[PDB]
Structures are given as structure tokens and as C-alpha cells.
Amino acid sequence: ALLRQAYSALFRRTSTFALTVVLGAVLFERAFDQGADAIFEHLNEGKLWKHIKHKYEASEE
Amino acid sequence: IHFGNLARVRHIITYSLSPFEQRAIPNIFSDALPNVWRRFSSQVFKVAPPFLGAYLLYSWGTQEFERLKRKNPADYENDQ
Amino acid sequence: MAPNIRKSHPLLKMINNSLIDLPAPSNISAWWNFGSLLAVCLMTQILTGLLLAMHYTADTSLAFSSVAHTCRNVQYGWLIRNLHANGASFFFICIFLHIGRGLYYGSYLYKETWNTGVILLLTLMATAFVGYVLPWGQMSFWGATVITNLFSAIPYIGHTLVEWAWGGFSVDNPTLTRFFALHFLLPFAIAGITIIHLTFLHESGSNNPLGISSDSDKIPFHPYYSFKDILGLTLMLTPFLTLALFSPNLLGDPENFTPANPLVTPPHIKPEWYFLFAYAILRSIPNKLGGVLALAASVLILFLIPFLHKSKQRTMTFRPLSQTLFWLLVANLLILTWIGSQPVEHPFIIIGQMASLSYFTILLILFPTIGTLENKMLNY
Amino acid sequence: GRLMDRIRKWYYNAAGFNKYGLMRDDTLYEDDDVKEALKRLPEDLYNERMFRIKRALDLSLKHRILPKEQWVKYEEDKPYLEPYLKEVIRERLEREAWNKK
Amino acid sequence: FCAQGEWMRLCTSTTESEVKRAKNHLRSAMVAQLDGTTPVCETIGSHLLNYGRRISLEEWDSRISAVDARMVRDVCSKYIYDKCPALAAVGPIEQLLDYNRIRSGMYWI
Ligand code: HEM
Ligand code: HEM
Ligand SMILES: CO/N=C(/C(=O)OC)c1ccccc1CO/N=C(/C)c1cccc(C(F)(F)F)c1
């Protein structure tokens, strides 16, 4: 039972609760950003400089 | 000090449960929605009307303003 | 001194008696969520304001471009600028719902809390007026001109007051620099007066939607309302951000993306939406002086509301005739807002005067009258 | 004929406080006169009013009303305070009139 | 406020000095419960019916002496800390208020 494990290990002691928020945030940020950016770029295939960059990036003159 | 000097109150009993013993959003279909509908119903005829009237006046005035920009052929029927 | 340090301490005690152990009615609705939003709104305007101020230059020759430099070069300057301009609208939407709630529920019966409120509104309007001029775009300049010229219509002291306000013979650099100072300053007066507002308020405590004493059922502000209010904050904050991030210029005039030019009058000089209702009333009275008074009266009228209450009951919850009159008035306001955005021509002209007239009638004659009438229908 | 009575009973139902189980007098704004009158109410009437009001505040926060069966009926609404209130006002006007003379 | 406060002290910061004294008070109490024939009889009838046997003061004392700060804290935390309590209030209780507020008094020393 994760809910109970979570409760006992993370949410019971106010100290561990804060620790869970901080460490929780650090991991949420890394994940959430990667996903958002990923979604944004997919919805904009070949429109961003990231996408057309190669055409002039060391392949001209 | 505002708690304890408010009102003379007698013979009222109240019962409440901890939040952890009960559900946050109970009986959505049996109680919630019916009431939402009930609340909407009891008010619609008080609120809606004037907003509807506003819309009409708005539409009229907007269309009437554009109609006055158009030309009336009756001003050129004898301009040969 | 006392057991817990939340009550003894000269400061925490203050924080506790107004945000924690503060007795609040158990039944106040979402309409009571606007006070806190107004406060948060105010802190936000001040914050983004300062951030913008740190990159602005109050000079006719640099204003426009300093704002452009901010949006184009400052890290997130474009975001801060958006939040500040759009936040002004969030502020007014909130202030108008706050007032509405008050009219509908008879909060105005708390006379001093009400009057300070009217003062907050007036100060907020002056703030936004002077703020709007700062970017020094076309609507910035012409709006400043149109409105300030209205005072040269005041008898004898007219022309003086105006040339004194401009610091010259027209809206020019001297006007801009004093407007920046005012804009920077007034928000702090708003914060100050807001404290007085809440101080009077705490004498009585909040009113509630049924309009009857809630002493029989009060609950601590925290966690009930701190949670309800935080929720209320995110619920409003979403549309706000959606607008500011997806449709940044929805509410602004394109005419302001052009540097002010005193030799080119824009075709349609009109204000931001939150002033339109008043602009409509202004233009309803063809006669420089009469219109100015009408404009003034359109807001000062709020100081009379406490004296026009005739009902034996506080709120309108149980007064159906007053309720429709109330929504008639609301619709009356959308109409004035709409007329305010239209050119001065038929049929907008006649419609405009109708709306202006009904506005004052509803607050001055009908509300008090219907209230009395209702008292009789309850055999009172 | 019975027109005034038709209107009243109509307004009474349109107002709707009876849906909260409140008496017309329960809904009065508590200005000075009303506050004095309340102090004169016998204990039982005062506690009944208090429960009714507390009950209404609880319904109000819940966004519910009483079941149709429990609604106060126009003709069964007890004007428990009107008598006291009229006396309080009569006394006030006497003093006001007298202090002018 | 102070009462719930003391419960939180129990779960988080009990001292050996406190338990040391608490034990002596408890010992005297158990002894005092066998002061006469009626009370000794009450004990026997109860112990049998509840423990299915008699627990001598000699045993009780053994158990009572094994208790220490660390133990009081663990046991108390186990039954009190962050638990939803049962509350009964009678009389002019307007100043006591909100289950929620009380429930919060159930955690963080
Ligand atoms: C910067 C503007 C303002 C701020 C920060 C502000 C803030 C507040 C706050 C925090 C409350 C308590 C919560 C609530 O009931 O919403 C309040 C209540 C109130 N305010 Fe304001 N207010 C502002 C403007 C006004 C205006 C313009 C009016 C009226 C013209 C006004 C009238 C009142 C009144 C009458 C109450 C009583 C509410 C009740 O009936 O319980 N306020 N205000
Ligand atoms: C009561 C809060 C405030 C309101 C309602 C408000 C309103 C406004 C408005 C309407 C504008 C014009 C926005 C645009 O369209 O460009 C503006 C601009 C500005 N405000 Fe404020 N403001 C407030 C507080 C502040 C404060 C406290 C400061 C800083 C001390 C500030 C600094 C500025 C600056 C520098 C600009 C110019 C840049 C720009 O136009 O974006 N504002 N403000
Ligand atoms: C400097 O002008 N700022 C404008 C604006 O939209 O700022 C958001 C503007 C723009 C176009 C026309 C009129 C106005 C001026 O405002 N117009 C009216 C009609 C008004 C009405 C009442 C009060 C006040 C005041 F003074 F803020 F107090 C102003």
C-alpha cells in the first residue's frame, strides 16, 4: 500500500513532508520542462530554428 | 477578542466529522447537480431578461449604424 | 504575558486578528473573494510596476522607446510589461465585482468601509490614468489631452487649473514627468487607504449573503477562507494569464504602438474598457461643463448609496423586484461600455443618453422607490 | 376585494426566505430599533429565532434549502417581533418629539 | 491550546526526569487502588474479567519501571500524533472552535 507507505515515510513528520516537497519539486521541474518543450516542438515541426539550423550551420559558402 | 462575546445562544447541538472520515465531493449526482440545476432555474428569469434585452439593443444599434452607411438608390434615380 | 505568542506579540497579534483567528461568517460566498484578490492584485501591480520603472525614462524623447527597450532587451521585460498592463484590467474587473457584491448585499450599510472604498476606486482610476500616459503612444497623448482639456471648462479657475496641471500650454514633457511621479506615488496611497478600509471593516466584521447576524455561526478565517481565497486566486488568475500569454493585445489600442504626435488626431479617441462606461456618460451631455459634471457624478454617485437604502432587509437576496432592477443596472453598464467604444453618431448618440439617464435614475430614484414598495408588500 | 392579499401572498413566495425556514421578522436588518426589540423578546421566542437563523446560515453555506414540506407557509408566518418593534419606535418618537418641545 | 500543546510535548520531547517522576506517581496510584477490601476485591474481579488473571503490584511495578522517555514518545506518537480526535463540548462554548483548528493541534510539537 503506497498510500500508507507514503504517509508513514513522507507525510507524517513535518520535516520529511518538506523534504518531499523540495525533492519533489526538483524532480517535477526536470520532468515537466522536458515534456512541455517536447510537446511544444512536436506541435511545431520544422518551424523552429532548431529545425532549419542545419541548412546554414556549416553547410554554406 | 471577538470569539466569546458574539451571541447569547442556547440549546443548539451540532455534529461534525473529521475531514478524513468523509468524502471531499460527495453525492455529485444525487445531490450536487440537482441543486446546481435548482439554483440556475430559480435565477435565470431574473438575470437573463435584461442581458437579453441588452443584446437586442446592441444588435439593432449595430445593424442600424451599418444600414445608414449604405446608399439609398432613391438619391440617384434621376441623375442622368 | 499570554500563553501563545500569536496573541501577545504586538505584531503577530495584528496578523492573527485579521488573518487567522478573525471571526468570519460561515456562509459568505465567492462574491466575498474579491477583497483578497484586490489586495493581491495591488501587490502585484506594485511589484511589476517597480520592475518596469527600473527601465523606464520619463522624457517625451525616450519614453516610447524605453518601454520598447524594456520589452525587447530586458530579460522577461516583455512579460513584466504584459502582466502590468493586463493586471490593470484584472484590477478593475475585480473592483467592479467587489462593488457589485456590495450594492447587491447592502455592504454599503457599513458606511465608513464603503466611503473609504469609494476613495480607493477614485485613487485607482487616477493611478491608471496617469499610468496610461507613460508609454507616450498616440492614445497615451490624446487621451491625456482630451480629458485634461475638460477642466478648462470649469468657471474662472478653469484655464488656470489646466495650465497648472500640464506645467505649460499643452500636454508635454513637463506633464509626463509629473505624471510618472504621480503614478509611482498613488499606488502607495492605495495600499495605505486599503489598511484604513479593512480597519473600519473589522469594527463590524463581514456581512453575509442572507443579511442577518452571523454571530450564531462564525468560523476562523484560517483555514476556511485562506483556502477558499487561494482557490479563488487561481481560478481568476488562469483567465488572466491565458489572456496575457495568448492574446496580449486583445484589450489594447493599436494606436498606442505609434509614437505620440500632436499633429495627428486619432480618428477614435477612446479609453481602455474600464473607463468606457464613464466616457459614454461624458459624451452624453453635449456641453463641455455639463458633461464634466456628469462624468464626475457617475462615480461620486457612489457616496450617496448608503443614504438611498429604504428596504427593511439588508441584502437583495429576498427582494426579487430589486434583483431585476439590479441586473437591469448591470446590463445598463454593459450598454454604456459599448456606447463608450462607439463613435458619436446616430443611433449611438440617442442610445447613449438613454443609458446615461437610466443609470442615474435606477440608483437615485428606482432603487429607493422599489425598496419602499417592497416594504409594503411584506406588510411593513 | 382580495387583491392586496393576492399580492402579498405572491410577494411572500417570490421573496423566498420561507425556503430557509425563516419568518419574515427573522429577515429584518438589525438597526437600532430592531436591536432594542430583540432584547425584549421572551427567552423562548429569542432562542427559536436564533436556531432558525443559525439553521438558515448553515443552509446558505451549503447552497441548499429546506425540503418543500418544511417551508413556512404565508398564513403560518408568526410576526413575533412586529409588536415589540412598533412599541420601541413609539417610545423613540415620543422622546424625540418631547426633546424638541 | 496549552492542553493539546502538552500532548505534542509528550510525542516529541519527553524527558527522563518527567517519566522518572511520572512513574513514581503511577506506582503510588496503583498501590492506592488496593487500599481496603472493597478496592482489592474490585481489582481482582476486574483483572480476571479483563486480563483473565491477576496482575500483582510486583508485576505492574516491573512493567512501570521499564518505561523511559524514548518509550513514552514512541507510544504517544503512535496513538496521538496526527490523529483525528473525538470532541465533546457542553456549555458556553463559543470561544472554543473549529474541529479543523483542533485537528491541526494534533501535530508539530
Ligand atoms: C483597492 C481596492 C479595494 C481593496 C484592496 C478592498 C479590499 C477589501 C477586503 C480585503 C474586504 C474583505 C473581503 C471582502 O468582503 O471582499 C473588503 C470589503 C469591503 N469593501 Fe473593499 N476593497 C477595495 C475597494 C472597495 C470599493 C471600491 C468599495 C466600495 C465602493 C469597497 C467596499 C467594501 C465593503 C462595503 C466591504 C464589506 C463587505 C461585506 O459586505 O462583508 N471596497 N474590501
Ligand atoms: C495601482 C497599481 C497600478 C496600476 C493600476 C497601474 C496601471 C498602469 C497602466 C494602465 C499603465 C499603462 C500600461 C500600458 O498599456 O503600457 C502603467 C504603466 C506603467 N506603470 Fe503602472 N500601474 C500601477 C502601479 C505602478 C507602480 C507602483 C509602478 C512603479 C513604481 C508602476 C510603473 C509603471 C511604469 C514604469 C509604466 C510604464 C511602462 C509601460 O507602459 O508598460 N505602475 N501602469
Ligand atoms: C491618459 O488617458 N488615459 C486613458 C485611459 O484609458 O487610461 C486607461 C484614456 C484614453 C482615451 C480617452 C480617455 C482616457 C482617460 O480616461 N477617461 C475617463 C473618461 C475617466 C473617467 C473617470 C475618471 C477618470 C480619471 F481621471 F482617471 F479619474 C478618467
PDB file of C-alpha atoms and ligand atoms in Angstrom, chain C residues 88 92 121-134 138-148 150-151 179 253 268-280 282 295-296 298-299, ligand 3:
ATOM      1  CA  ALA C  88      -4.625  46.830 -14.520  1.00  0.00           C
ATOM      2  CA  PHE C  92     -10.778  46.778 -12.452  1.00  0.00           C
ATOM      3  CA  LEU C 121     -11.791  53.411  -6.617  1.00  0.00           C
ATOM      4  CA  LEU C 122     -11.133  57.071  -7.353  1.00  0.00           C
ATOM      5  CA  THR C 123      -7.448  56.704  -6.472  1.00  0.00           C
ATOM      6  CA  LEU C 124      -7.234  53.566  -8.625  1.00  0.00           C
ATOM      7  CA  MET C 125      -8.667  55.444 -11.597  1.00  0.00           C
ATOM      8  CA  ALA C 126      -6.309  58.358 -11.235  1.00  0.00           C
ATOM      9  CA  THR C 127      -3.450  55.843 -10.976  1.00  0.00           C
ATOM     10  CA  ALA C 128      -4.401  54.082 -14.206  1.00  0.00           C
ATOM     11  CA  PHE C 129      -4.983  57.382 -15.966  1.00  0.00           C
ATOM     12  CA  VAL C 130      -1.502  58.709 -15.288  1.00  0.00           C
ATOM     13  CA  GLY C 131      -0.035  55.284 -15.849  1.00  0.00           C
ATOM     14  CA  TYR C 132      -1.565  55.046 -19.320  1.00  0.00           C
ATOM     15  CA  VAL C 133       0.226  58.195 -20.396  1.00  0.00           C
ATOM     16  CA  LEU C 134       3.705  56.887 -19.665  1.00  0.00           C
ATOM     17  CA  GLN C 138      -0.810  58.103 -29.645  1.00  0.00           C
ATOM     18  CA  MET C 139      -3.676  57.130 -27.356  1.00  0.00           C
ATOM     19  CA  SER C 140      -1.446  57.978 -24.402  1.00  0.00           C
ATOM     20  CA  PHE C 141      -1.094  61.529 -25.567  1.00  0.00           C
ATOM     21  CA  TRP C 142      -4.569  62.127 -26.939  1.00  0.00           C
ATOM     22  CA  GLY C 143      -6.342  60.548 -24.005  1.00  0.00           C
ATOM     23  CA  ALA C 144      -4.306  62.788 -21.733  1.00  0.00           C
ATOM     24  CA  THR C 145      -5.267  65.790 -23.885  1.00  0.00           C
ATOM     25  CA  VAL C 146      -8.964  65.086 -24.215  1.00  0.00           C
ATOM     26  CA  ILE C 147      -9.521  64.509 -20.505  1.00  0.00           C
ATOM     27  CA  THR C 148      -7.326  67.281 -19.102  1.00  0.00           C
ATOM     28  CA  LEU C 150     -12.171  69.160 -19.816  1.00  0.00           C
ATOM     29  CA  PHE C 151     -11.115  71.212 -16.864  1.00  0.00           C
ATOM     30  CA  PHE C 179       2.590  62.014 -14.258  1.00  0.00           C
ATOM     31  CA  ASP C 253      -5.442  50.062 -28.757  1.00  0.00           C
ATOM     32  CA  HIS C 268     -11.402  57.378 -32.493  1.00  0.00           C
ATOM     33  CA  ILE C 269     -10.044  58.615 -29.181  1.00  0.00           C
ATOM     34  CA  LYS C 270     -11.436  56.173 -26.656  1.00  0.00           C
ATOM     35  CA  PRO C 271     -10.191  54.759 -23.325  1.00  0.00           C
ATOM     36  CA  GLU C 272      -9.370  51.324 -22.029  1.00  0.00           C
ATOM     37  CA  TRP C 273     -12.537  49.315 -21.468  1.00  0.00           C
ATOM     38  CA  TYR C 274     -12.783  50.032 -17.733  1.00  0.00           C
ATOM     39  CA  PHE C 275     -13.326  53.776 -18.401  1.00  0.00           C
ATOM     40  CA  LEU C 276     -15.730  53.388 -21.343  1.00  0.00           C
ATOM     41  CA  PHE C 277     -18.877  53.488 -19.222  1.00  0.00           C
ATOM     42  CA  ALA C 278     -17.780  56.890 -17.888  1.00  0.00           C
ATOM     43  CA  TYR C 279     -16.660  58.116 -21.286  1.00  0.00           C
ATOM     44  CA  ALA C 280     -20.164  57.354 -22.562  1.00  0.00           C
ATOM     45  CA  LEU C 282     -19.227  62.168 -20.506  1.00  0.00           C
ATOM     46  CA  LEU C 295     -18.669  62.277 -15.543  1.00  0.00           C
ATOM     47  CA  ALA C 296     -17.806  63.352 -12.034  1.00  0.00           C
ATOM     48  CA  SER C 298     -21.102  58.989 -12.474  1.00  0.00           C
ATOM     49  CA  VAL C 299     -18.604  57.923  -9.842  1.00  0.00           C
TER      50      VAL C 299
HETATM   51  C1  LIG F   3      -4.433  59.484 -20.375  1.00  0.00           C
HETATM   52  O1  LIG F   3      -5.622  58.925 -20.938  1.00  0.00           O
HETATM   53  N1  LIG F   3      -5.785  57.654 -20.486  1.00  0.00           N
HETATM   54  C2  LIG F   3      -6.827  56.939 -20.900  1.00  0.00           C
HETATM   55  C3  LIG F   3      -7.014  55.507 -20.401  1.00  0.00           C
HETATM   56  O2  LIG F   3      -7.799  54.761 -20.983  1.00  0.00           O
HETATM   57  O3  LIG F   3      -6.281  55.070 -19.341  1.00  0.00           O
HETATM   58  C4  LIG F   3      -6.600  53.716 -19.007  1.00  0.00           C
HETATM   59  C5  LIG F   3      -7.725  57.464 -21.821  1.00  0.00           C
HETATM   60  C6  LIG F   3      -7.624  57.107 -23.161  1.00  0.00           C
HETATM   61  C7  LIG F   3      -8.514  57.630 -24.092  1.00  0.00           C
HETATM   62  C8  LIG F   3      -9.509  58.510 -23.675  1.00  0.00           C
HETATM   63  C9  LIG F   3      -9.609  58.867 -22.336  1.00  0.00           C
HETATM   64  C10 LIG F   3      -8.715  58.350 -21.405  1.00  0.00           C
HETATM   65  C11 LIG F   3      -8.871  58.907 -19.989  1.00  0.00           C
HETATM   66  O4  LIG F   3      -9.764  58.325 -19.036  1.00  0.00           O
HETATM   67  N2  LIG F   3     -11.079  58.602 -19.240  1.00  0.00           N
HETATM   68  C12 LIG F   3     -12.058  58.860 -18.381  1.00  0.00           C
HETATM   69  C13 LIG F   3     -13.347  59.100 -19.167  1.00  0.00           C
HETATM   70  C14 LIG F   3     -12.116  58.952 -16.991  1.00  0.00           C
HETATM   71  C15 LIG F   3     -13.344  58.830 -16.350  1.00  0.00           C
HETATM   72  C16 LIG F   3     -13.434  58.975 -14.970  1.00  0.00           C
HETATM   73  C17 LIG F   3     -12.286  59.242 -14.234  1.00  0.00           C
HETATM   74  C18 LIG F   3     -11.052  59.363 -14.865  1.00  0.00           C
HETATM   75  C19 LIG F   3      -9.785  59.628 -14.042  1.00  0.00           C
HETATM   76  F1  LIG F   3      -9.169  60.727 -14.469  1.00  0.00           F
HETATM   77  F2  LIG F   3      -8.963  58.590 -14.171  1.00  0.00           F
HETATM   78  F3  LIG F   3     -10.075  59.785 -12.752  1.00  0.00           F
HETATM   79  C20 LIG F   3     -10.973  59.216 -16.248  1.00  0.00           C
END
